Ligand binder design. Structure first.
Ligand SMILES: *[C@@H]1O[C@H](CO)[C@@H](O[C@@H]2O[C@H](CO)[C@@H](O)[C@H](O)[C@H]2NC(C)=O)[C@H](O)[C@H]1NC(C)=O
Ligand SMILES: *[C@@H]1O[C@H](CO)[C@@H](O)[C@H](O)[C@H]1NC(C)=O
Ligand SMILES: *[C@@H]1O[C@H](CO)[C@@H](O)[C@H](O)[C@H]1NC(C)=O
Lengths: 184, 200
């Protein structure tokens, strides 16, 4: 329970798999930010910012290899643990803009969700209590040192004096969806 | 002439040894490469985790797999028999290669200049410093040309998840006609600081 001291840290990479449901993810990170994930069904590398893949490749087979190995390890460890199931955590969210809010100037609203476990979640946005799906992006599940995850959702918006926003989080560890409110 | 990013191999346990209402079972593998002073020092740590419990770890400072908990006691013996030399070799073929050949030309060259703005919110000035990369930054407050040390407070560094950061830096102040307050930002993307002034 003590940090390792370093100038930089690469996660090359991180793998998670869970059963039942056959849900998994494979990513690489550098200094805490996502480089890519591998789409395991499409068998393709998806870069976090398109520029990352202009000079560099990652073969998706590496992600398929890690996921296959983790499915194998999960079977063995599940039995060895006497079939001890995961504990559903209660995630917690905070909402903040990317840039200082200026009238009429396009901006991005960020919903940061922490203490996610297992890594299955729905994060959605409301504007003036109405669901908004246009201009919404999500990160992969990013790893925490205690082996939970965090995730961020992004909502393109134009600040006004006539808009109220909510981030809505649904998770198995929540009895009812939690709403995180935000106004200028 | 694309360059390949490589990965740390997830070792397999030996077999046969020894939905909100549904149970779920989770396994994780984390391959971590720690770098200091370029690649002069590299440390490799791989972790195998059942649900939330890390039970097995390779740490290149130790040089072999070790059980982290009782759950990993026989795992560590099996992995040291099957994967020990392969894992030791990944420090060079994966960690060092990725750093020197893929991070040096990309991540480590990324420079995003901060944007700086001041707002007043008895009382307190707030300097919002946004959209910068990398994380190393220094934010200083001045009043009429002299640096303020208190009451200067800062939020935590905020990670936006899009390879930028932001931070808020606050100054406890009382406005008088007609002082000048300056937020002063030094960052590796800037040859000389960015400053913003605020006047009563
Ligand atoms: C995330 O949202 C989806 C879609 O609303 C949920 O999937 C639905 O779940 C309900 C009740 O469990 C089912 O009756 C629907 O048939 C599902 N719809 C689809 C399209 O699959 C999902 O359960 C939510 N996830 C979490 C963790 O709450
Ligand atoms: C395993 O789980 C079962 C049911 O939860 C319990 O009866 C038993 O004591 C546990 N331990 C072992 C070693 O079987
Ligand atoms: C950093 O590494 C270089 C070569 O790898 C070495 O020559 C130099 O002395 C190191 N600097 C420090 C402060 O250790």
């Amino acid at each position: 329970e003590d940090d390792i001291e370093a100038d930089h840290v690469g996660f090359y990479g991180t793998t998670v798999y869970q059963s039942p449901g056959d849900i998994g993810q494979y990513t690489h990170e550098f200094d805490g930010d996502e480089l890519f994930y591998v789409d395991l069904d499409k068998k393709k590398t998806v870069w976090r910012l398109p520029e990352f893949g202009q000079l560099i490749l990652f073969e998706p087979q590496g992600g398929l290899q890690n996921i296959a190995a983790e499915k194998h390890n999960l079977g063995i460890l599940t039995k060895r643990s006497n079939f001890t199931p995961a504990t559903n955590e209660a995630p917690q969210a905070t909402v903040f803009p990317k840039s200082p809010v200026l009238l009429g100037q396009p901006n991005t609203l960020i919903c940061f969700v922490d203490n996610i476990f297992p890594p299955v979640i729905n994060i959605t946005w409301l504007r003036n209590s109405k669901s908004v799906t246009d201009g919404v992006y999500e990160t992969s599940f990013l790893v925490n040192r205690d082996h939970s995850f965090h995730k961020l959702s992004y909502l393109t918006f134009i600040p006004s004096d006539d808009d109220i926003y909510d981030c809505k989080v649904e998770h198995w560890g929540l009895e009812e969806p939690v709403l995180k409110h935000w106004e200028p | 002439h694309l360059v390949e990013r490589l990965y740390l191999v997830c070792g397999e346990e030996g077999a046969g040894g020894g939905g909100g209402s549904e149970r779920h079972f989770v396994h994780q593998f984390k391959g971590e490469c720690y770098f200091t002073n370029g690649t002069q020092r590299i440390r490799l740590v791989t972790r195998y985790i059942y649900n939330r419990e890390e039970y097995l770890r390779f740490d290149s400072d130790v040089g072999e797999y070790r059980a982290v908990t009782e759950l990993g006691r026989h795992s560590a013996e099996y992995y040291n028999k099957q994967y020990l030399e392969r894992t030791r070799a990944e420090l060079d073929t994966a960690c060092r290669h990725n750093y020197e050949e893929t991070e040096v030309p990309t991540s480590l060259r990324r420079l995003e200049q901060p944007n700086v703005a001041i707002s007043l919110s008895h009382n307190t000035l707030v300097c919002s410093v946004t959209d910068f990369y990398p994380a190393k930054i220094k934010v200083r407050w001045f009043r009429n040309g002299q640096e303020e040390t208190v009451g200067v407070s800062s939020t935590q560094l905020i990670r936006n998840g899009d390879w930028t950061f932001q931070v808020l830096v606050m100054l406890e102040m009382t406005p008088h006609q007609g002082e000048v307050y300056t937020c002063h930002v030094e960052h590796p993307s800037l040859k000389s600081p960015i400053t913003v002034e605020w006047r009563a």
